[model samples]
Target: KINLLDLNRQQMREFFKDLGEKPFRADQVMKWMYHYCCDNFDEMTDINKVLRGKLKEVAEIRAPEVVEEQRSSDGTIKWAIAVGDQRVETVYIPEDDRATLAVSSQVGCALECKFCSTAQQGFNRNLRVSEIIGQVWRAAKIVGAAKVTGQRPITNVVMMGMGEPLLNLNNVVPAMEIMLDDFGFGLSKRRVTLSTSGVVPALDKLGDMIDVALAISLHAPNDEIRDEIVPINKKYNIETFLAAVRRYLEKSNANQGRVTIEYVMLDHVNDGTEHAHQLAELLKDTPCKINLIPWNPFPGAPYGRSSNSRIDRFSKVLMSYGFTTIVRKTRGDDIDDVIDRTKRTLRKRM
Candidate 1:
């Protein structure tokens, strides 16, 4: 059976032509499939009933089963989606303007990164293109976007949920293709960001294939520390990954794009003021921004989250270098949102 969710525009066009229908049907179906987030064939109002009946017979707009769901008062919703037998989690975070979905890429993850929880869970196979994009459709229904014409709670999708996306670029690429298609999510290339753990080889090819904003999980400033927490650094090294970052911006068809350099602050592990200095020196000439994530939501973490003052100091060092830097804000910060508050204070005076 043709799961309509699995095909791209050209493929969908061909499918419609083969069914003895107009090629324009592809856009109509996609608008319903993705924009309207509709699955029931009969409910596709623009299509003729006979064609809809035929579509129901030869194909279906299939989505993965949502095994379990959880919603919070903070407007964050999480879903346990079933792919084949195992499960992957997807989250909807409602921000002031845009609600970003932390969409998973793989069932588990390619791992052994000591600080990474997904790495600790061990690797599973890459998610299928169908399974990868299905998360967005499901979340749209749960969030109730009123058929997606106007702004919805989910405006951006960041592929940073679980697993290394670059590891599964074979499937991840096409899934993103669908996400960026005007007939699909119709999101700006700037909006659909991919946060990879610096899989240098695939990242190199990614620029040639698609143009979207990027985030590197560069948790450590220097090779020595990164080589420990992010073990993949040993194979590709920080220099090689940063080189790849340059190549990506050079090939970025969309101009004015800045790659997001992510450094999760680990107390005494890699959050020293000097580490920020090293990071500044490391990215001095690169076109990018620094995002320092204060490690959160982990119980008995191997490394402690950096102190508030240390994080602020670290950001000051990067900001002093003329690089934009901010700490990631998690709900129930349990401490204070002093980083961005200071960011506003500092930038306002600037």
Candidate 2:
């Protein structure tokens, strides 16, 4: 039996065709499953009874079990989800104009980026397409249920939670299709982002296939520092990675045809004036904006958050270089909704 949530529109249509049924039935099922959030074919009243019965025998709509849900004092929410025996985290960050959901693509990460908590836990497995997109559905249900006034819940989604999305491209691509599907979540290309730790070949593949937003986890300006921080840089390296990013931006339809450069600020590590200058020089020709995230600490984390003064000065240098720089506000610190905290907690206990 096929898991219905795993297939995108075209694949669903093909599935119906293979069943000797009219392909349009797949479109109908998509609306019911995604827009209406119906779990069973019995709930799809518009689909004929005979077809519904057939669907019941041939397919299932499954959501990963929600292990726990917590809300931070700052209105961010995180869910611990169970996909088989392995667990992953999904986060919902609410802002005035829009809310963003951070969805995981793997149980844990294999790339051991020295500063990342998920890296410390080690890899389990890539999430299925169902599991990847399931995070969005789960978060949307909770957000819609809350019915918060004056705020549009979950306007953006980032493949940035537990693992490297590019590493799970087979599943992540289909899941991303649902996020961009009109009948599914109906999010615009600009609103759906997939962050990568400089997966060069996968980055090229993604550029050819989809035009969604892209973010590079560029913690260091030079290979010497980056090699120690983002280990993937050792394989792809800075020049090769940035060249792929340029190609992506050339193809991307994101706002102003720009990519986002995610730089985490680690005190006395990579947040100094010299590092900032090198960063500006590195990104001088790329059409991009910089987002400086002060390190969010976890238990036994070897780094400290960059001082506000340091963060400010770093931004100034980037801005002086004609790039728009913003310091990401520290949200949900009280509830561990901040990035990589949940994975850190699990690793510490084990």
Candidate 3:
């Protein structure tokens, strides 16, 4: 029997119908599954005692399956999970005031951006709906018990783990629906952010479908540079990308949801004061925020992190220009922590 934890509310209805149980039973199961964080069928107390037993007879609760785990010195934890026989990585960044979970929508990315590791790995597989959202459910259980167990914190969610989220729209969108559903995860839409690597048209598609905050992995400020960094720019250059963002703002609300332009700070590559000035100019009229993420180097990665002084100067220029700017802290160590978890998972398979 497959776990009930994998099924969304509507899927639960269908599962119940197949079982000859009323649709209402699905609703009850959903409530108990998410609301109380119920992991076992027997733990579903609100449902009729007999029906609960019947549910146990067929469906199971598919909780997070951690093939390997690595804890960083900085309190960041990375979990490499088994999706069938393959493994995908997700990270939990826990801080004092806020926490964030980085979830992957696909196994390997179709778009091979120059600096990203997953891009080099190539597209492996599209994650199932259960595989997509199960990462969060698993992290929730991990964090919920953490403080009591001498662990850390985790609060928000970011779809920027291993692959492009927009490419997995069918499963990704529904997984998001469950994450924000009132009776399910109940997370605020404002708290959830979806980051993409400049999938031009898909940005507008997402704008129409999902109302969550948006972030673009805009490594370079202009088309000439962006094309070299984010290869998608060859087909849809900065002008096209900016135009799409503008259209999204026009189509979406300008007041509530502001698009965030993510600039990865790569040393001597895209982190120049001249480029910083251009960045300010490029975003001056756009309704967006600037997030500067220092490049986290993977072994053999062609680039290194931008100097702290340079990154700071870049942030100062943007903030001085009256643009909302933030420098996000690098969470998990890709080499030490992330790869360690991956190794553990591989060992278990043997």
Best by TM-score: 2
Off by over 4 Å in 2: 145-152, 337-350
Best to worst by TM-score, what's the order?
2, 1, 3
lDDT values for all models: 0.83, 0.86, 0.78
In the predicted model 3, the residue pairs found to clash are 3-60, 3-62, 4-60
Clashes of each: 0, 0, 3
Please give me the total number of clashing residue pairs in predicted model 3. 3
Model 1 lDDT tens row, 1-350: 79888888888999999999999988899888887889998788889998998899999988888988777767777788999988898888887877888888998887566767767668888888888888888888767744654666467889873889998887788888888898888778888889987888899999988998798888988899989988889898988998888898888744266788888888788888888899889887777878888785365558776798999999998899899887887752322154975798899998
Error of 2 at 22 (Å): 2.1
Cα lDDT tens digits, model 2, 1-350, are: 89988999999999999877898889888877777666788867788888888888999998787889999988999899989878899999998888899999998899998888888999989999999888887777667622233333568999864799999999999999998898788888899999999889998899888889898888898999999999888899999998998888777776457788899999999999899999999988788889999887788888987899999998998888888998999878888656567889899999
The TM-scores, one per candidate, come to 0.91, 0.92, 0.87
Residues 212-316 of candidate 3: C-alpha lDDT, one tens digit per residue = 767778888788888888888888787777788777767655226568888889998898888889998987667788889887777788889888999999889
Models, CA RMSD each: 10.2, 4.8, 4.0
Which scores higher on TM-score, 1 or 3? 1
